Design a protein around this ligand. Structure first.
Ligand SMILES: [Ca+2]
Ligand SMILES: [Ca+2]
Ligand SMILES: [Ca+2]
Ligand SMILES: [Ca+2]
Ligand SMILES: [Ca+2]
Ligand SMILES: [Ca+2]
Ligand SMILES: [Ca+2]
Ligand SMILES: [Ca+2]
Lengths: 387, 387
């Protein structure tokens, strides 16, 4: 009864917690300056408990005098994975990010971002007078909203935590879906580029002020940054390195890469999106017959932006009970339903998915799974292979 | 490499599995008969592994000659919880269901369903000549899309599994959101009601054919059903009782009920939906200041139907890392941030949520949590109380 009031009330307070837990980047036009502004919070986990808030204010304005696209209000949704290179002796960060635009219901610069673009990042910083520099290199693939980079502190040890520098260290690699392409300021500014400025307030601590130039130099997208940090506490969360480096129990880069390859089999036109047409094609080639309504409801189920298609980050979320999943997978492979996957059936399944492999490569797949040497893959063999 | 091909391919097949895993009820108009049709599959878990498919074809036509609403294409999404009454010696089923309409983008009979409506269900069946009867009683609350019923076999032992009878045993209790109210055939037919007919094919087994009359008799919504089952196998999944009764590890009815009470504190107008206005009000009363964009993005995050508001089933899904959640909950209660929740602060938090309690009831809440007898609730006390 008292316990029921605590529960009731606690559920409500935890609900506001759960709802506020994953703040997106809120973008708005700035007509006056021919650009945009953005406002958002970042919650950095504190080692051993709690969150350090970082309140971001941002403005971007074009570098050139050309025309740009000035967007309606929308947001960007970001997923970030931080890691370490075990062979790297310098202070560093490996970063993987997926960013997609959303929040509007239902071509200048686009051509620069259709494939993989090399990226260079240079940062010179001063935090409480501690001078430092960072340089990073990698690739962006705006089709998947994907950025992959490795960063090095080129002045020795970073005097602030790596996670605090992530937002500072190329929003032109965000995936805007088709209906929102007219709201992509970032690409419209290219190749001449844009200036990005922010102030970032760390609750109960200091602030960063940054200015950056983001432009192409040849075929490379370059982000060159000046950062000044003031008013930080010597034993606070930033200067004290009390923030958690990476989120626990995320997927491996290698697992993500296998999911991307899997996504490819569906996205036959390579535009970074799975439509009902494409999902249907694959399902039908497998011997299944969804209706249009079933195909649509299937997509809706995982359609976070509500565009009617599955983009890669949405697919990754779904792929990120197990026994029953593996058993149903087995039936799809075992086309005639006799309890054995034959080399022929596997050949056919590969063709059905659009997976081009020689007959010898297929034989090697069976051989890897085929414990009892009958040249076929039974259910128990399939489970060992799948787990 | 062979392993990578298996993984790649397996991920794709499992993805079609995950996507197809929760089929909704697809509804379409039937202009000719002044009614609707529906098509959907039910996957029943087989004890010890696998799924028994049940392919449903449905048609409804009005009982009276009055006008009805003939809908555009849409669907219903259903969550079901089956349980047992430990005191009941008769063969029975306790059923809790939430049903909401979706799949259209962006008043006759409505007035009958604004509060809680008592329900009576009567079924007479013949399966492979085995005669049986079922009678059930409970309540529906269409505001939350909620049905709660208890069913008894009144002829002795049920010759088929309880889960196979769920779809047969009142879609007028579905929650249609505001923008879709003109597509609610089921309520528009009331009080005179409708006839519902289905054929249900159990893959590799027999079929059921049902006919039902659904209407008000006085203030009670009555579902009276005739079921005929033919062609079932004596040792198949149905006549053999080889289907799993209930899904494992669902919430208790008592937990759901505490979540509903929590939902109430937000839904101040009691219409079954939380708007950004209402979420804002509560958050602000707590000392928080979301912007409109933050409030909207918060809702979007859990908005499965894409209507812009949180209905109860959407809230339940969110409420259905823990340490960090409890720590952030503590800070909301501990308004001045001194490490102790005072009786005053708890009083204020109750008022902030719209939770009406006497000062004595609040004192009893502290007393229940207050292990060390200082009249306040510290963090460790709060964790013990919350877990
Ligand atoms: Ca595509
Ligand atoms: Ca989508
Ligand atoms: Ca086979
Ligand atoms: Ca074998
Ligand atoms: Ca409301
Ligand atoms: Ca909603
Ligand atoms: Ca306090
Ligand atoms: Ca105490």
């Amino acid at each position: 009864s008292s316990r029921r009031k605590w529960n009731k009330t606690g559920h409500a307070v935890r609900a506001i917690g759960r709802l506020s837990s994953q703040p997106n980047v809120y973008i708005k036009a700035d007509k006056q300056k021919n650009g945009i502004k953005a406002n958002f919070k970042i919650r950095h986990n504190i080692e051993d408990g709690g969150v350090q808030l970082a309140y971001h204010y941002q403005q971007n304005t074009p570098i050139g005098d050309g025309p740009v696209l000035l967007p309606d209000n929308h947001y960007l949704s970001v997923q970030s994975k931080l890691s370490k290179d075990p062979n790297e002796k310098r202070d560093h960060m490996v970063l993987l990010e997926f960013v997609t635009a959303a929040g509007i219901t239902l071509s200048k610069g686009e051509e620069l971002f259709t494939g993989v673009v090399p990226i260079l990042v240079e940062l010179d910083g001063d935090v409480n007078g501690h001078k430092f520099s960072v340089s990073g290199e990698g690739e962006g693939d705006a089709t998947y909203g994907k950025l992959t980079l490795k960063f090095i502190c080129t002045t020795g040890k970073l005097p602030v935590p790596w996670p605090t520098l992530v937002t500072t260290l190329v929003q032109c690699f965000s995936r805007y879906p088709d209906h929102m392409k007219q709201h992509d300021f970032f690409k419209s500014a290219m190749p001449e580029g844009y200036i990005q400025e922010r102030t970032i307030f760390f609750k109960d601590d200091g602030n960063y002020k940054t200015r950056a130039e983001v432009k192409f130099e040849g075929d490379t997208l370059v982000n060159r940054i000046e950062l000044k940090g003031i008013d930080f506490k010597e034993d606070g969360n930033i200067l004290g390195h009390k923030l958690e480096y990476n989120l626990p129990d995320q997927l491996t880069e290698e697992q993500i890469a296998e999911f991307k390859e899997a996504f490819s089999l569906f996205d036959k036109d390579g535009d970074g999106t799975i439509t009902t047409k494409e999902l249907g094609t694959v399902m039908r080639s497998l011997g299944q017959n969804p209706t249009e309504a079933e195909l649509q409801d299937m997509i809706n189920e995982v359609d976070a932006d509500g565009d009617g298609t599955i983009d890669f980050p949405e697919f990754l979320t779904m792929m990120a009970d197990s026994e029953e999943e593996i058993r149903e997978a087995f039936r799809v492979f075992d086309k005639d339903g006799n309890g054995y996957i034959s080399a022929a059936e596997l050949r056919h399944v590969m063709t059905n998915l659009g997976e081009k492999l020689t007959d010898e490569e297929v034989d090697e797949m069976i051989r890897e799974a085929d414990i009892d040497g009958d040249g076929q893959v039974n259910y128990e063999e399939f489970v060992q292979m799948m787990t």
